[PDB]
Design a protein around this nucleic acid. Structure first.
Lengths: 135, 199, 87, 80
RNA sequence: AUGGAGAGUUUGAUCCUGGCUCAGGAUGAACGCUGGCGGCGUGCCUAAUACAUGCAAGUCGAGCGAACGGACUGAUGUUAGCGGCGGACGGGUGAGUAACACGUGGAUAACCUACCUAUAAGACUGGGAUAACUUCGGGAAACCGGAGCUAAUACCGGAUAAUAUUUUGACGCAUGGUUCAAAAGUGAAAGACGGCUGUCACUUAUAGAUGGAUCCGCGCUGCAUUAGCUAGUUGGUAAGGUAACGGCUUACCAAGGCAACGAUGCAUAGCCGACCUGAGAGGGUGAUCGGCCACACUGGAACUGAGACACGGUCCAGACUCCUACGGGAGGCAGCAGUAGGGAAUCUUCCGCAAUGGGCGAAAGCCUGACGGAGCAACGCCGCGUGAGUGAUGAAGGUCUUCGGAUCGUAAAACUCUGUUAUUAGGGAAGAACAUAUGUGUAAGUAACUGUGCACAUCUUGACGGUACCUAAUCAGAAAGCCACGGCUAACUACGUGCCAGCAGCCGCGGUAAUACGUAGGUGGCAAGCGUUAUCCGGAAUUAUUGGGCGUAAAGCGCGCGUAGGCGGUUUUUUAAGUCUGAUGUGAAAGCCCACGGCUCAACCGUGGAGGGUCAUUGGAAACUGGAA
C-alpha cells in the first residue's frame, strides 16, 4: 500500500497456532481455573487402552491410549514400541508429536518413565523407547 | 587425548595422511569399513565442506565446539578469516611442541604438554590449547630433560619452520614469527571450512 | 549518613573493591552517588589502590565519613593528611 | 531556570478564566518515517479572559491550577 | 565492505502462485540412555497455597534508679526496669497496577529532610511524678487493678533568644529579594575527664550534602463484533486542611470537561537497563545482577516517629489454625533453612562475622540467615582427562562373500613410555587492612594539662582451611556413551518379518530379495555428554519501510457528490518548524564490541575506550519541505 495507508493501518502479521495445545495449559485446583504454562511434558491417567485403525494409505493396528492429563483435558496418545504394560488407571507421561496416520492422536506416551516400561528387546535406540543398557 | 582412536582409519576416510606422513595411505588408500574396498560414490557440496573440516580438526586432535570456538576467535582478527584460523591452530601449545620437534607426532606432544613437561616461559603450562604468542620461550622441564622419548625425536625432527627458532641445546624454543600461509599445512583448503560454517 | 565505603566487585575468593561515596542506607553493591577510586587487596604483594583527589576532598568537606579501611586507603595517599591541613 | 512555552490556538472559551489551547505538533512514525500531525489540547488560565475562540496565543506552564490547568496565558497576538 | 546459502512437496510431464515441512541459534528447561574431574555461574517459572521446628534486630551501666547480683570497699555483669537511638535500613515476592507505574528530558518564584558537615549564638532558673522495688488482691493462662516509696540526658512551669509569624516603609502571572521599625510568642543536659578546661550530649538559626514529595513534554499491550463517556464531573468564587499546589474536601454559582489523533469498557501485564534471535531493518522476552514501583493471611484505620499509615509494631472486622476452668486468650516463612500440597520440574532444618556493608556504643565489643563461605543437582559455559611411541591394513573371532577373499585394523597382543588424573605422605599462600591499645612528634585550641585531628611504627586476628597449590613414590592401571546411515543430510550390507509387527519432520516405507521396520557387523556425527519434547527468532521477501501484490492464481468498492485527512504548478523576498552542521548537560553502574592486564589457558574477573536519544539548551547554513508577503 501507500505510506499513508501503512501509517493509518500498520501491517498485521499472522498469529501462530501451536500444535499440542494441551501441553500449553495448566490448572489451578484452588481457584478452579485454567492457566497458561507451556510444559515440555504432562502427566495423566489412562482412561482407555486400545487399538486404532490407521489412515487409508497405510494398514496396521496401532496401539493408543485415552489420557486425562493433569489438566481437565482428555487427549489421545500414541504408544511407541512393540510391547506395553498399560491398562486403565495407569499413570503415564505424555509428550508432544502427532501420528500422521491416526486421526485424533496428537501426542506420544513416553516409554521408560513413570509407570511405563520400555521395549523389552530394544538394543539400538534405547534413548527413545525406554529400556536400559543391556549388561 | 580426546579422540584416542585409529589414526589410519581417519586418514583413510579422509584424503590426507594426518600423522605419519604417508605410512597410513599405502596399501589401502580407500575408505575403511565393509564397503571401503568397493568403488566410491561422488561427494556433494556438503560432503566436501564437511570432509575438509574433519581434515583440519582431526589433524590437530581438537574437538568440535572448541574447533568452532577457535574459528570464532579467528574471525575477530584482521585479514582473511581462513588464514587467521589456521594460524591460530598452529599457535596451539600442543602443536607448537610437535612442530618444534620435541615429540615425533601430535598425540605424543599432547601428552607431553598435558603431563606438564613443557614449562612455557619457565612456568608450568599443562594446557594443550594454550595460545602461544610471538616472543615466548617453550623450554623443557628440568626433571623431564632426561626423557628418552624427548631426546629420541630431538635429532630426527630435522626441519623446523621459520616461525619457530629451535635450540637443540637446552631444549628451548622461541616462536619468533607469526606463521604465514606458506608454512601452514598445504593439503587443507582454508576457503572450504569458512564456507562450511556459513551454511 | 553519607559514607565513603568499598563495594565488592570480585568473584569467588578474588575480591575487587571500588572506592565509592554512597548513602549508608543503600545496599553494599547497590545504589551509589559517586565513584572515587579502586582497591585491589589481592594483587602482587602490596594491595594496589587508586584514589582520586579532587572528589575525595570534595566529599570529605561535605561531611562524608570514611569507614575504617577507606580511612587507611585515604591515609596511604596522604588524603587524610591534606584534609587535616585545611583546618 | 526556564518554564516551557507553547503556541497554540484557542478552541474553547466557554469557561470563565479558562481557555483551551490546541497546540498542534508533528510526530514521525517509528517504522515508516512519515511525519504525522498530532494535536494536544492545553487548558490555560487567564484571569482577564480576553482570549476568544480562534485566537493564536502564547502559553507558559505554571504550578497546578485546578484539576487540569497547568498553564497561563502570556500573549495574545491574533484577532480573528 | 567483515555482512545475507537453501532443500523437499500440488502434475502424465512443465512454468508460475501458494501453503506445509526440514536443515541454524537459544532456554531458570523437563524427560530417556549414559556419566570421570575441576573452575566460574545457576537452581519452585506452578499454589501471592498452608505451614511443624530452629535462627533472620538489637544496642548503650561513660544517660540512671535498683530486691539489684556479686570479685575484693565492693572490678564486673542486666539478672529485670526507665530513658536514647535503631526497629521505615538490610532481606523477600510480583499479587495488584495500562498508571506520570516505569524510561528519558525538564520544572517547583507550590515543597519536606533525623543522623552527617560547617558557621554562629547559647545551654539560665524552679517544680511535680513514675517505672524498677515492696505489699495486697483478682484471673485457668494472657495478663489486670489497688496502696507505699525512688532516680534520671524521663516529664512539666517561668527567664532569654533568631532570617520564625503580624503590621510597617524602602518578575516569568501567582512575584521573588534584603534592609527597615514596632508587636506577640518559640529552648536546652548532662555524662565521663584533666588542671578553669578538654571530649561528646543538647537547643536555636542558617547553609551544604543526603534522602524523599509534586507537576509537566515525549515514549510505553490487544480488542471498534468496546462508541459516546463524566457529573467533583469541568471551570470559578469563598472556606477548610496539606510539608506543599491543586475539586484535595465542603458550600454556592455557571454548564461545563474528554472522545475515531480511539473517551469509556473488557482482557492481559510489574516497568527499565538488559537478554535471545536476525546481515540489517526488525521480531520475541523481562530468570540470576543493578535502578524504580507495589505488596506482607484478606480488608479498613490511625499512634509513635525526621521519615510508616509499618514483613519478624498497634486497634477493628473477616477466613482459617491452636489453648481454655467457656469467661476468655494466641498466631501469620512472598526473611534463611526446612515440611506438606500442586507440578514435568528447581537444593542443606550447614559454618562464621575472618573480609565488605549496616545498627548501637567513646571504644573494647554485641547483633547481622545482609554478606563471606561450605552441602546437593552435567542445569549451563569453559578447561583437562579416560592414555602414548614402535608395532603385520595376517593371529583368534564377528560380519559378509562372487568362496578366491574382504572388513573391523596398527585396532590387538607384543615390547618400551608417561602420571594430566588417581592413591598416600610431607610442606602449604594470598585474601590481613584494621579498629583498639601502645609509644613517638605535629596542628588547632590552650593559663596549662588532659583530650581531638593528622603523621609514623609496634602488638595483635582466617569460617573457608591444613582448603587452593607444590614436592616425592606408584599404577596404564579406576575413568564412553548417545544418536544417525533412502532424499533433504555425513555414514550400507546381511539376516528375521511379510501392508503384520512396526517406522515416520515432510516426501513416505512395510504385501517372501526394506541401504525406510527389529537385530548383527560396518560406517558417520558428536562426546561427559547424546537425543526427544516444550517455547522464541531465523530460514519466511509467508505483512514486503528496507523488501510483495490486485486482467485470468487472493485481491479495484456497482457508480457518483463529497467532509476530515494525505499530497500539490513557476518566480522573488523573508523566517527557520522540519532538514543539516557544531558546542554544552545528560542518556547510572553492571551488560554488547574493541584493547589491555590477572587467574598455568579458557570460562571468569578488573581497567580503558567505544557505542547507545524522534533527548534538552544554545550558535551557524538556507537548497528542499513547512510559515508569512
Amino acid at each position: 500500500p501507500t505510506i499513508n495507508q501503512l501509517v493509518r493501518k500498520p501491517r498485521q502479521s499472522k498469529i501462530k497456532k501451536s500444535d499440542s495445545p494441551a501441553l500449553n495449559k495448566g490448572f489451578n485446583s484452588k481457584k478452579k481455573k485454567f492457566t497458561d504454562l507451556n510444559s515440555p511434558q504432562k502427566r495423566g491417567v489412562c482412561t482407555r487402552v486400545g487399538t486404532m485403525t490407521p489412515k487409508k494409505p497405510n494398514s496396521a493396528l496401532r496401539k493408543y491410549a485415552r489420557v486425562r492429563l493433569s489438566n481437565n483435558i482428555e487427549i489421545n496418545a500414541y504408544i511407541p514400541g512393540i510391547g506395553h504394560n498399560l491398562q486403565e488407571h495407569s499413570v503415564v507421561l505424555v509428550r508432544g508429536g502427532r501420528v500422521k496416520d491416526l486421526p485424533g492422536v496428537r501426542y506420544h506416551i513416553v516409554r521408560g518413565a513413570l509407570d511405563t516400561s520400555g521395549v523389552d528387546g530394544r538394543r539400538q535406540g534405547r534413548s527413545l523407547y525406554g529400556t536400559k543398557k543391556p549388561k | 587425548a580426546r579422540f584416542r582412536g585409529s589414526n589410519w582409519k581417519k586418514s583413510r576416510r579422509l584424503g590426507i595422511s594426518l600423522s605419519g606422513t604417508g605410512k597410513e595411505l599405502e596399501k589401502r588408500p580407500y575408505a575403511p569399513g565393509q564397503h571401503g574396498p568397493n568403488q566410491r560414490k561422488k561427494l556433494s557440496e556438503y560432503g566436501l565442506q564437511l570432509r575438509e573440516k574433519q581434515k583440519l580438526r582431526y589433524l590437530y586432535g581438537m574437538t568440535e565446539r572448541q574447533f568452532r570456538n577457535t574459528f570464532d576467535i579467528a574471525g575477530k582478527k584482521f585479514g582473511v578469516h581462513g588464514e587467521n584460523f589456521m594460524i591460530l591452530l598452529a599457535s596451539r601449545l600442543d602443536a607448537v611442541v610437535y612442530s618444534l620437534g620435541l615429540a615425533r607426532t601430535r598425540r605424543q606432544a599432547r601428552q607431553l604438554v598435558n603431563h606438564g613437561h613443557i614449562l612455557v616461559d619457565g612456568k608450568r603450562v599443562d594446557i594443550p590449547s594454550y595460545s602461544v604468542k610471538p616472543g615466548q620461550t617453550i623450554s623443557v622441564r628440568e626433571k623431564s630433560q632426561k626423557l628418552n622419548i624427548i631426546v629420541e625425536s630431538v635429532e630426527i625432527n630435522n626441519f623446523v619452520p621459520e616461525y619457530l627458532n629451535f635450540d637443540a641445546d637446552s631444549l628451548t624454543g622461541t616462536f619468533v614469527r607469526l606463521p604465514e600461509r606458506s608454512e601452514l599445512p598445504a593439503e587443507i583448503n582454508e576457503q572450504l571450512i569458512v564456507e562450511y560454517y556459513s551454511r | 549518613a553519607v559514607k565513603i565505603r568499598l563495594t565488592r566487585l570480585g568473584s569467588k575468593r578474588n575480591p575487587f573493591y571500588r572506592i565509592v561515596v554512597a548513602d549508608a542506607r543503600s545496599p553494599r553493591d547497590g545504589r551509589i552517588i559517586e565513584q572515587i577510586g579502586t582497591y585491589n587487596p589481592t594483587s602482587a604483594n602490596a594491595p594496589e589502590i587508586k584514589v582520586d583527589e579532587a572528589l575525595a576532598l570534595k566529599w570529605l568537606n561535605d561531611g562524608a565519613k570514611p569507614t575504617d579501611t577507606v580511612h587507611n586507603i585515604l591515609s596511604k595517599e596522604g588524603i587524610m593528611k591534606k584534609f587535616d591541613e585545611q583546618k | 531556570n526556564d518554564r516551557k512555552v507553547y503556541v497554540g490556538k484557542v478552541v474553547s472559551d466557554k469557561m470563565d478564566k479558562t481557555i483551551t489551547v490546541l497546540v498542534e505538533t508533528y510526530k514521525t512514525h517509528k517504522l515508516y518515517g512519515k511525519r504525522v500531525k498530532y494535536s494536544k489540547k492545553y487548558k490555560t488560565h487567564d484571569e482577564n479572559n480576553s482570549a476568544k475562540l480562534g485566537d493564536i496565543v502564547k502559553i507558559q506552564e505554571t504550578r497546578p491550577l485546578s484539576a487540569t490547568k497547568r498553564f497561563r496565558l502570556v500573549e495574545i497576538v491574533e484577532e480573528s
